[PDB]
Design a protein around this ligand. Structure first.
Ligand SMILES: Nc1ncnc2c1ncn2[C@@H]1O[C@H](COP(=O)(O)OP(=O)(O)OP(O)(O)=S)[C@@H](O)[C@H]1O
Ligand SMILES: Nc1ncnc2c1ncn2[C@@H]1O[C@H](COP(=O)(O)OP(=O)(O)OP(O)(O)=S)[C@@H](O)[C@H]1O
Ligand SMILES: Nc1ncnc2c1ncn2[C@@H]1O[C@H](COP(=O)(O)OP(=O)(O)OP(O)(O)=S)[C@@H](O)[C@H]1O
Ligand SMILES: Nc1ncnc2c1ncn2[C@@H]1O[C@H](COP(=O)(O)OP(=O)(O)OP(O)(O)=S)[C@@H](O)[C@H]1O
Ligand SMILES: [Mg+2]
Ligand SMILES: [Mg+2]
Ligand SMILES: [Mg+2]
Ligand SMILES: [Mg+2]
Lengths: 630, 497, 191
């Protein structure tokens, strides 16, 4: 025949138990049935976003037809899925395709109207087989679709429908748009509780009902490209795969340590200074300890909500996982790990730390970004240092951050350079700078450096951004900013802070400089701010500590070249006393180090006078710092 | 396949062939006007879309035919309602076709309710079998109460269905129901549950927007004008302008509308108007014109309303934009239409347009005392007259003025934000009672009139969530004990008793 | 983990160009050869589907579609044993699209959803934006594996591993200071 070669009987697959359970969608299946039992235009198209359950509604229709859960008119219908690919696939000669399609329509007519035809990707029918003999497969079904002799259930998408079907308005009337909405969180919890058994029987795991309600909730919050129930089923399915692979060979940490010890085995083979046999010894010891503990517990065989949190942390990037003990001890020493690079400045390091502890504890507002700070103070005091210390803490790299220099933005066009051009204009398809970058990695640190150097109504973009965590680029898609830390470094009160940091506590200083900021900003924008923190100028003990930091990184810049450098305890006093003035922060220390060490030291390294290997001591003359060779 | 046009082309301008063609108004332009000789072989007969009364005549003859097919009865008020309602709400299609579509789907619905059982029995039947399988999956609940209530109500409606042994005709109510499921607009008659909800409109908004009485009243009156059939059918449902200082609940009232009407805050056409500070962001919201880059993608406002014609359109912080966007809004607000770049008009007449702004912040903060509401509205409307044009603030349905939040208001907002914090910590696995002196410290360390009710949220954030996150991450607080937020001399501290 | 799902066994490897995306699937194939995978994948076949060889000689109506349908039936005949590999997955998105022809996106789009085709993808993070996010249904068929650019220490380990192959080709000896110099200096200066 012709129906047996170009269709697939969905009621047979529902009869043989090969279609998934279909849960909910009572209104949509009812309205599909009401449109199928018309006299003319028996044609419902199921139209919604991709992933919301459109093929699921038709498979549920087939299962209710098999189970007799339909009205008396439908008991005994057949749901045949028209595969348009086969119809086009064999048809090489002129007239071959039209013959096949007409033969399909004749065999559908010979069923006395006892067949529901199904065309998913209905938009692959407008122009199917158009050639010189352009009968197009939409122009041939069009009389049968007009007269209701063909009960075609289509299921196209919502943008595919406009690009493909609304271009041809003669076929667009033949169908009836049945809108399928995305299910809510509660409906997706009810869906996953019935599809649970099939994923359990495929993956041979058990899926705890907390993992179901957690999968629905966390995918609704932390995934923005996709739609329920599809992303919830993605979390459940990939977590079951993860548990199955652990039970199959061996757990996570044993795999991590086994791969890293075979890695360093190959690398120690390649090194035949090292500081590698120490690392391989440490990893072998830790692997043997965890192997002993694994033989003691002889684990993970269920799928709890913790597995869902791990799968969501690897999918998106946002750390929603449970805090392991090493990372949690690292994060309780947040403030201590930040004072290895930003000495002084207690208030802002604490504020940064409290924002990330709110974010990891699970107490942050889900409707706003993680932390939206305003750094103020004089120049050279560790504003941009604290932002770079954040990015190095959080992502283990200094310049791993979406950094926007707000001094390129002195004119009102730079709004377009961070959200992109509108439709019709030059940089339309190239996107915007802020939107694309945050949409790539949703969990990121955003820096908006020198925020006073911009046009004053550029920060209205940031009104949207800081209050709701949303920003829509020119192409119309909204980027979600609810996992970002937005920092705005500025110096709008530097003369005031340098003037009156004596004889004032921190609160009166914040009050007075926040009045100054109110003179510079708008009351909308300094209401969206999580916490304004004010920096203090650097005293002499601060510049002594900064001198030790910068000299440590100089020792590292010259040890890699091959030189070992000590310093006198008196020469560091000369650097700390020559590089201090309370107007410029810790940059005069940096160019004093640059001059008084690196100009004679590079004068002498190029001279060949200073042989490597010997310890280069930096001792004082009466006023200079001379290098010696002993 | 010359092939099929040039063969007939001599045989048509000699009158031998009597070819009655029938093509569309755009297939002629694309496929027949392209070849001018074949274009002159045919005489263009123009078949215009009929009026409403012609559609009523067509549907009377087809009433006879569709009644003899579905074995139902179609009442003549259902015909005149199908013609009227399809002419007003379905803008995609044409007459008499969409009126026949309403008639035929209503006869299908009536035939199914005659055949199996009514609507509400099928609703509760599918819901009790659904919750029965979900209780089978839960073998904490808070589902046995809900399933027992649904089983009780299904037993009651089953007894009432045996007591009336319904719907076997097709009246105008079923036409309205088919239209409300086709389009999305609640053209249906009010049932008991929806009308009891909708007379509680102002009560259900003040569970999220405390204070702000005049705006809640204006919104509520717009939607009650809409459902009662008294809205002007040539304009949108409501077109507001929200003014005030910051943090007073403008964007909250828009979100409370979207949550009321649509069961979600993020079900609204939210347009952040501060992105429109240029003169080509009009093309961001309408679309690229023909021959340009972003042409095929449509607009943004026009597509979002043309998918769902019953929606809430938020235009947030609207004073930030450049005034040409307000010219686009002139079209939208007066006659409920907007043409996008592909030349198809979009019917905005079933939407509520809300425009939040803060144009009289200093004036409202300075003179809300010692003035009533009317003189305050007059003075801030003078300020609005300076910023906007007399065109644009003449199409605004109502200009409501938000008041600054007082001490009792920030106490109530403090209880709302603490309830959602209790929700987060309960979903984490923790329980908090708070002390009443601690709630006094929150409501007194978060009051200043210039910034509304965001300093309250910052004071909650700092004075609770920073030490509480310090203690939860430290292992100091244990899952399964009540965390009493007691007070020191100046600080809220957490304990474990 | 993504290949052994019930439905949507479709990992698309997405990163910047050069970061080692084709090399991840070559490392997967070598682990399947050496037996370093779990017991589920022991014995799979990583086949590299060729878009250019499918489109190549198919000018008649319905010849690309017949080639591609024969490919899908032969993969269904393997009983779930063949991990399919398509690099430059955007080439798959626009492959057999003639005037009214079922392209490779719309013909693989049912079997990708149903988990019966184990297609491993690989596409650049900007080809993905231009071409695959353009079509949101085929975009949801795949799971994104973000391949980040490796650090300097990872690059030193990689170059210590690939050293013997460049020695056997060029017939020179590469010293380990040259390796740490290459990784450090190219990370610093080449932008
Ligand atoms: N209401 C539902 N009940 C049960 N399972 C569902 C439901 N909705 C979706 N699913 C399942 O969730 C996944 C969604 O996939 P599909 O619904 O087939 O995607 P789709 O709806 O066809 O959308 P596109 O555009 O075709 S990708 C499948 O595994 C379905 O079986
Ligand atoms: N508190 C600090 N702790 C450690 N190093 C610091 C500190 N303040 C400044 N430095 C050093 O001084 C350099 C310049 O400091 P920055 O923080 O970049 O200046 P700034 O805070 O950005 O002020 P402006 O207004 O942007 S110039 C940094 O690269 C550090 O090496
Ligand atoms: N009446 C209120 N009831 C409850 N919460 C409120 C109320 N007013 C403000 N809020 C809170 O304040 C936050 C911001 O209020 P919004 O109305 O969004 O500010 P706004 O009205 O847009 O003023 P601007 O222009 O942003 S300064 C909301 O997220 C609420 O949490
Ligand atoms: N982890 C790795 N181990 C060994 N060699 C690697 C590794 N990653 C990349 N390479 C080598 O780096 C070179 C380029 O990597 P490729 O994966 O081929 O680039 P790519 O990821 O395919 O990006 P495009 O899009 O093809 S330009 C090849 O010589 C690979 O062998
Ligand atoms: Mg589908
Ligand atoms: Mg700086
Ligand atoms: Mg607002
Ligand atoms: Mg490659």
């Amino acid at each position: 025949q012709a129906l047996k070669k170009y269709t697939i009987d969905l009621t047979e697959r529902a009869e043989q138990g090969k279609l998934d359970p279909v849960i909910g969608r009572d209104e949509e299946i009812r309205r599909t049935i009401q449109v199928l039992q018309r006299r003319t235009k028996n044609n419902p198209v199921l139209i919604g976003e991709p992933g919301v359950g459109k093929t699921a509604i038709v498979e549920g229709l087939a299962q209710r037809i098999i189970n007799g859960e339909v009205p008396e008119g439908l008991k005994g219908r057949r749901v045949l899925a028209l595969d348009m690919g086969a119809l086009v696939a064999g048809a090489k000669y002129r007239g071959e395709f039209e013959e096949r399609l007409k033969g399909v329509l004749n065999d559908l007519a010979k069923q006395e109207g006892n067949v529901i035809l199904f065309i998913d990707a209905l938009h692959t029918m407008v122009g199917a087989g158009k050639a010189d003999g352009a009968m197009d497969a939409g122009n041939m079904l069009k009389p049968a679709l007009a007269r209701g002799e063909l009960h075609c259930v289509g299921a196209t998408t919502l943008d595919e429908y406009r690009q493909y079907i609304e271009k041809d308005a003669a076929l667009e009337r033949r169908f009836q748009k049945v809108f399928v909405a995305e299910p809510s969180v509660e409906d997706t919890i009810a869906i996953l509780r019935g599809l649970k058994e099939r994923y359990e029987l495929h993956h041979h795991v058990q899926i705890t009902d907390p993992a179901i309600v957690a999968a629905a909730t966390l995918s609704h919050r932390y995934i923005a490209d996709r739609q329920l129930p599809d992303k919830a089923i993605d979390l459940i399915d990939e977590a079951a795969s993860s548990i199955r692979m652990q039970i199959d060979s061996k757990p996570e940490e044993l795999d991590r340590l086994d791969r890293r010890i075979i890695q360093l085995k190959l690398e120690q083979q390649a090194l035949m200074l090292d500081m590698l046999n120490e690392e391989l010894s440490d990893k072998e010891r830790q692997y043997s300890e965890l192997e002993e503990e694994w033989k003691a517990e002889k684990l993970r065989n269920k799928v709890t909500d913790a597995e869902i949190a791990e799968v969501l942390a690897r999918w998106t990037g946002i750390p929603v996982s449970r805090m392991m003990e090493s990372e949690r001890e690292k994060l309780l020493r947040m403030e201590q790990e930040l004072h290895h690079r930003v000495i002084g400045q207690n208030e802002a390091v604490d504020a940064v730390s409290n924002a990330i502890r709110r974010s990891r504890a699970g107490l942050a507002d889900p409707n706003r970004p993680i932390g939206s700070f305003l750094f103020l103070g004089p120049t050279g005091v560790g504003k941009t240092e604290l932002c770079k210390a954040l990015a190095n803490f959080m992502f283990d790299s200094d310049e791993a951050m979406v950094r926007i220099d707000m001094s390129e933005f002195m004119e009102k066009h730079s709004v377009s350079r961070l959200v992109g051009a509108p439709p019709g204009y030059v940089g339309y398809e190239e996107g915007g700078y802020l939107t694309e970058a945050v949409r790539r990695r949703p969990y990121s640190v955003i820096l908006l450096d020198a925020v006073e150097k911009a046009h004053p109504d550029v920060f209205n973009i940031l009104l949207q951004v800081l209050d709701d965590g949303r920003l829509t680029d020119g192409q119309g898609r909204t980027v979600d900013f609810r996992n970002t830390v937005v920092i705005m470094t500025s110096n709008l009160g530097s003369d005031l802070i340098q003037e009156r940091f004596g004889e004032l506590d921190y609160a009166h200083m914040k009050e007075l400089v926040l009045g100054v900021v109110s003179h510079n900003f708008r009351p909308e924008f300094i209401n969206r701010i999580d916490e304004v923190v004010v920096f203090h100028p650097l005293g002499e003990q601060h510049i002594a500590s900064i001198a030790q930091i910068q000299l440590k990184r100089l020792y590292k810049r010259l040890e890699e070249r091959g030189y070992e450098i000590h310093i006198s305890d008196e020469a560091l006093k000369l650097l700390s006393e020559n590089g201090y003035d309370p107007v410029y922060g810790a940059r005069p220390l940096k160019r004093a180090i640059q001059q008084q060490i690196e100009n004679p030291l590079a004068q002498q390294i190029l001279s060949g006078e200073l042989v490597p290997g010997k310890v280069i001591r930096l001792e004082v003359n009466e006023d200079r710092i001379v290098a010696v060779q002993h």
